[PDB]
Amino acid sequence: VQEVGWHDVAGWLGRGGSMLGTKRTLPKGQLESIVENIRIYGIHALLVVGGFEAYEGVLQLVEARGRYEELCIVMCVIPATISNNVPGTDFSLGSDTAVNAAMESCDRIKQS
Amino acid sequence: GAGKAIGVLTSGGDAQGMNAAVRAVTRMGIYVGAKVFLIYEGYEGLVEGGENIKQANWLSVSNIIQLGGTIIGSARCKAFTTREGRRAAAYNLVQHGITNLCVIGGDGSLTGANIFRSEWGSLLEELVAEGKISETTARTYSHLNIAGLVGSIDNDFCGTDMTIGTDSALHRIMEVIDAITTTAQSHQRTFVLEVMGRHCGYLALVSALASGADWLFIPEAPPEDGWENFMCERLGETRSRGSRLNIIIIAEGAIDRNGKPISSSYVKDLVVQRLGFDTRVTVLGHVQRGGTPSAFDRILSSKMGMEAVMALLEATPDTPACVVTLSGNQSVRLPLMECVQMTKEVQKAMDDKRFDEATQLRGGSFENNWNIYKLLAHQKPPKEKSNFSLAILNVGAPAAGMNAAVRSAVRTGISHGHTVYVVHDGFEGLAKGQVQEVGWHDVAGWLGRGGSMLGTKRTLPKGQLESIVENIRIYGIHALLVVGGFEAYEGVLQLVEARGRYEELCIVMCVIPATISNNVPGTDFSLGSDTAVNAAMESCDRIKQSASGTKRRVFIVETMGGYCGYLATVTGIAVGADAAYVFEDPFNIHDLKVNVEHMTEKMKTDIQRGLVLRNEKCHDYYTTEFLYNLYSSEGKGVFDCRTNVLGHLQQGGAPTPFDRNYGTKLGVKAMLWLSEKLREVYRKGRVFANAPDSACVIGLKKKAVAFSPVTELKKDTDFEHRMPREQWWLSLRLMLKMLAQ
Amino acid sequence: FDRNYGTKLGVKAMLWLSEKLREVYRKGRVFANAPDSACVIGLKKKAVAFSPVTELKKDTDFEHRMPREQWWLSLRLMLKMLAQ
Ligand SMILES: Nc1ncnc2c1ncn2[C@@H]1O[C@H](COP(=O)(O)OP(=O)(O)O)[C@@H](O)[C@H]1O
Ligand SMILES: Nc1ncnc2c1ncn2[C@@H]1O[C@H](COP(=O)(O)OP(=O)(O)O)[C@@H](O)[C@H]1O
Ligand SMILES: Nc1ncnc2c1ncn2[C@@H]1O[C@H](COP(=O)(O)OP(=O)(O)O)[C@@H](O)[C@H]1O
Ligand SMILES: O=P(O)(O)OC[C@H]1O[C@](O)(COP(=O)(O)O)[C@@H](O)[C@@H]1O
Ligand SMILES: O=P(O)(O)OC[C@H]1O[C@](O)(CO)[C@@H](O)[C@@H]1O
């Protein structure tokens, strides 16, 4: 974990993929370590932008509140995955680029 | 569904409750279409035969249910032991055409009955051989079927949870001991009471537990060597440290480690010699075998007699002899020889000094009760000194036995080293502070006081939830043992839903259901309903006596109980009411017309009286005034009617021994569970209980305790009518209806 | 061996089952709660033994469905040495 400033994220608008890096890991395997990092840094909100595994992970943190104390923390998901499969959203962030790439690939195949 | 005959007889040691069993057996047997014979004197009249036996109708067993003992004698017999008496009895039964025989009595009568069944065929062969009876009659009556009821106050029969008449004997013991405790406290006299109990100390343990007696003698746990010094240590410790009175219970079958009997006279001589405390000795004698049977004995005996007749009807010759008993709180049916031999093996192993083997053979419930009483009796020095905190509240209406549960909760909490607080006036008081610490001696002697000493209210928390949060923070409470009624359950539910926005309410909560209506969910018998049923029983008995005096009269009794009709149903069974209108059984004008018609027909017979109950809110429109007008109008010319409202008499006076013991048991058990959760969720030196498992209702399920969580139960309650979705006791309404013509 | 082993296990398992079933019958109803009421008949190193089913749980790999330790691991040295 590291603090971020205003200039630290300038120019990242036009870069594909993810700059911070992403994973398919789920919290409940390492939930104790997540609790330790939330306490040491004293975090008070998680804006978990991601795909389906983001939704499932936030669900696990919600039900993890029953025993753990510092997971009483505001959480906000942002659905971003090409498949457009997170619930509660019609268009997920980043599916349009995927449809366009599929469109261009199929156009080239159709020409062949 | 029957075209055969039944025989009913009581034998062995008499115990109040027999008359109710005979009434239920007779009326059920007639209701199915069989022929019932009343065998006076038990086995003696059975052998004698002739006039001692007579066929009975619906009215032969009327106006006896409220009497103790038996009306048909139960005289002990000897000739039935010899085969000459058994063949004479078989001749009498065949001459009356009895092929099914329900025997009520102890283990010895059942043993003799089972032997008589085992040789029935040979006896009929002998009777045909001598020419007394024809072969065709012997072929018609070729088999005998048996159903046994354990009528005893000692409660030693191993196959049964509760034997017929033991609870009423505990009532007689409690009447006597409450009388003694007055003079004992007055003159600082240590008393010695000698209860009954052949070779089972169940009556002694239950009386001691329900009375807070300072020492007990029972054969299941004989006192260790040199127990006299331990007597001196305990009695000196209590009497020096505030104990005005002291009570010593002694079963008549008490023994030592060497099996030698310990005389009550030895107890008196020891206490006088070693301490010089002014003291006396008393033997309750045969008072415990008589009196008006308690409501539990009437209801139980009626149900068990019904089930016994059902067993006789559906039994076959290949089926062995069976006894109808209680497991948990239902009517199971067990084979006879297994329970008899189990009882002989236990009693013999006790005689053989294999005390531990007898302890496991009897059942763990006895040992758990013995351990609970030992813990609660005298103060052991605590050592843990935990950091937790407790606030025990009384919520709802006052109900007999709530003081007992609060007493056990405090003392069990102290034994675990908590810092228990008592909050007066429920959630209303907790909002206004009114919190004080409690010590061990602060709650002594509250076992035998009815109502609630701390005070109770119907207030719910959500109106003053902010003030509750302030008081939880300032006192730093870490658990709430909310003993109370339905409003307790709803209040704890509000605190659960309030956890989402308040950090202070992340607190373990344990409900204890205590309210007369028996309407909290997740519990079968709520603490303090038994005293209410008994008070309703006594009130209706007095009204029934008044009605029988002025012939041709009916009474409309409006019992309490909220929307739940447990109280109206069970008291109707316990007093033989003509009906008990209840919300759970919707009725229209046609049912009331039918009930009036039953009353019109019944008024032609000898029993020119009636009684119909009504829960206070069993119907939106049909008020008690409406029923009074209907019965009087349509019953014009044959009888008149009067109305009564058993108001807060239902809450009863002193708590009955069952409610006293049950409160003590729920207090200790809820405290052990609470001290389990309360440390299982300990983290960062603080408690954080937020899962739904942390808010429960300790309740007596079918077999034993179960801790159902509040949120799961939320789907099994009707908040509008304030009662659970499904109650277990609806089957009893069938018995109530069948026992009326 | 499989016919003999099947026959011998069937007899001995049935005998143990009848023994315990007669042991736990009391007061007219069967009631089997202790862990010894559920076991696996198996030929141990020497002869037959009845291991409680729950007690074996600490020596079972439910991920891969096999015991933690197996006796036949010594045979792998046999296989490798007998080959060049
Ligand atoms: N070995 C037996 N055979 C036949 N009947 C017996 C036997 N033992 C006891 N009884 C019966 O028990 C009756 C009364 O004896 P008792 O033991 O005092 O009654 P209870 O059943 O209450 O223990 C006797 O009349 C007898 O019929
Ligand atoms: N209130 C009591 N009533 C009857 N017997 C008791 C009572 N208290 C103790 N005893 C008997 O004395 C035995 C040991 O006494 P106890 O109070 O447990 O001291 P300790 O901690 O040394 O065991 C107990 O097992 C019991 O048999
Ligand atoms: N007065 C009563 N009303 C309703 N049920 C009762 C009454 N007395 C006893 N019972 C039932 O019979 C059971 C007998 O309890 P007992 O053998 O003394 O052990 P324990 O109290 O630990 O359960 C009780 O648990 C209860 O289910
Ligand atoms: O019966 P509930 O609804 O559980 O509440 C307990 C008390 O409420 C009652 O209705 C009595 O009402 P009040 O005491 O307020 O007059 C009884 O059922 C009982 O004494
Ligand atoms: O000798 P009795 O009249 O049977 O009375 C004493 C005995 O009666 C009993 O009630 C037997 O039913 C025992 O409890 C008691 O020991």
Question: B394 C-alpha vs ligand 4 centroid, how far in Å?
Answer: 14
Given a contact cutoff of 8 angstroms between Cβ atoms, the answer to whether B163 and B175 are in contact is no
Q: What is the C-alpha separation between B481 and B334, in angstroms, rounded? A: 39
A73 CB-near residues (< 8 Å, 6+ apart): A38, A43, A44, A45, A46, A61
A55, A61, B72, B349, B735 from B299: Cα distances, Å: 58, 53, 20, 34, 10
Q: Tell me the DSSP string of B462-524.
A: GGGHHHHHHHHHHHT--EEEEEESHHHHHHHHHHHHHTTT-STT--EEEEEEB-TT--STT-S
> Which subunits count as partners of chain C given 3+ CB pairs below 8 Å?
B
Both tokens assigned to B341: 């031999």
Question: B660 C-alpha vs ligand 4 centroid, how far in Å?
Answer: 20
Question: B114 C-alpha vs ligand 3 centroid, how far in Å?
Answer: 28
Given a contact cutoff of 8 angstroms between Cβ atoms, the answer to whether B302 and B498 are in contact is no
B335: chain C residues, CB-CB within 8 Å? 28
Three-class secondary structure of residue A47 per DSSP: strand
Q: B680 to chain A: nearest residue by CA?
A: A67
Q: What is the C-alpha separation between B14 and C67, in angstroms, rounded? A: 63
Strands (E) located in B284-353: 322-327, 330-335
Give the domain extent around B225. 166-289
B485 pocket-lining for ligand 4 (C-beta < 6 Å): yes
Q: Tell me the DSSP string of B269-303.
A: HHHHHHT---EEEEE-TTGGG-SSPPHHHHHHHHH
Q: With an 8 Å Cβ cutoff, is C27 touching chain B? A: yes
B111 pocket-lining for ligand 1 (C-beta < 6 Å): yes
Q: What is the C-alpha separation between B711 and B690, in angstroms, rounded? A: 12
Q: What is the C-alpha separation between B57 and B36, in angstroms, rounded? A: 8
B159: chain C residues, CB-CB within 8 Å? 27-28
Which residues have C-beta atoms less than 6 Å from ligand 5? Answer: B 13, 152-154, 196-198, 252
Nearest-atom index, ligand 5, CA of B13: 12
Closest CA to B472 of B391, B385, B406: B391
Both tokens assigned to A57: 């992970």
Helix axes A52-64, A31-41, angle to 10 degrees: 80
Q: B499 to chain A: nearest residue by CA?
A: A66
Cite the DSSP H helix spans in B517-564: 529-549
| Sign, Cα dihedral of B584, B588, B592, B593 | negative
Q: For chain A, how many residues are written?
A: 112
What determination technique applies here? cryo-EM
B377 pocket-lining for ligand 2 (C-beta < 6 Å): yes
Q: Which helix (H) or strand (E) holds B392?
A: strand B390-395
Question: B627 C-alpha vs ligand 2 centroid, how far in Å?
Answer: 60
Residue to mutate, B16, B301, B329, B526, ligand 3, most ligand atoms under 8 Å from C-beta: B329
Closest CA to B484 of B443, B515, B446: B515
* CA of B338 vs chain C CAs: smallest distance (Å): 5
Resolution in A: 3.6
- Smallest-distance ligand from the CA of B164: 3
Q: With an 8 Å Cβ cutoff, is C28 touching chain B? A: yes
Query: Is B297 labeled as catalytic in the residue annotation?
Result: no
Q: What is the C-alpha separation between C38 and C32, in angstroms, rounded? A: 9
Closest CA to B527 of B517, B537, B535: B517
CA atoms within a 13 Å half-sphere pointing along the CA-CB vector of A63: 7
Q: With an 8 Å Cβ cutoff, is C3 touching chain B? A: no
Q: B686 to chain A: nearest residue by CA?
A: A69
DSSP 8-state class, residue B382? P
φ/ψ of B370, rounded to 5, equals -65, -40
> Which subunits count as partners of chain A given 3+ CB pairs below 8 Å?
B
Contact state of A69 with B691 under an 8 Å Cβ cutoff: no
Question: B729 C-alpha vs ligand 5 centroid, how far in Å?
Answer: 34
B287 annotated to bind ligand: yes
- The CATH number of the domain holding residue B171 is 3.40.50.460
Q: With an 8 Å Cβ cutoff, is A66 touching chain B? A: yes
| Sign, Cα dihedral of B428, B429, B432, B433 | negative
The alpha carbon of residue B444 and the mean position of all alpha carbons in its chain are separated, in whole angstroms, by 25
Active-site entry in B154, B156, B167, B425:
B154
Residue identified by tokens 């899962």 is B691
Chain B from 659 to 688: CB within 8 A of any A CB: 681, 683-684, 686, 688
The C-alpha angle B629, B635, B640, rounded to 5 degrees, equals 75
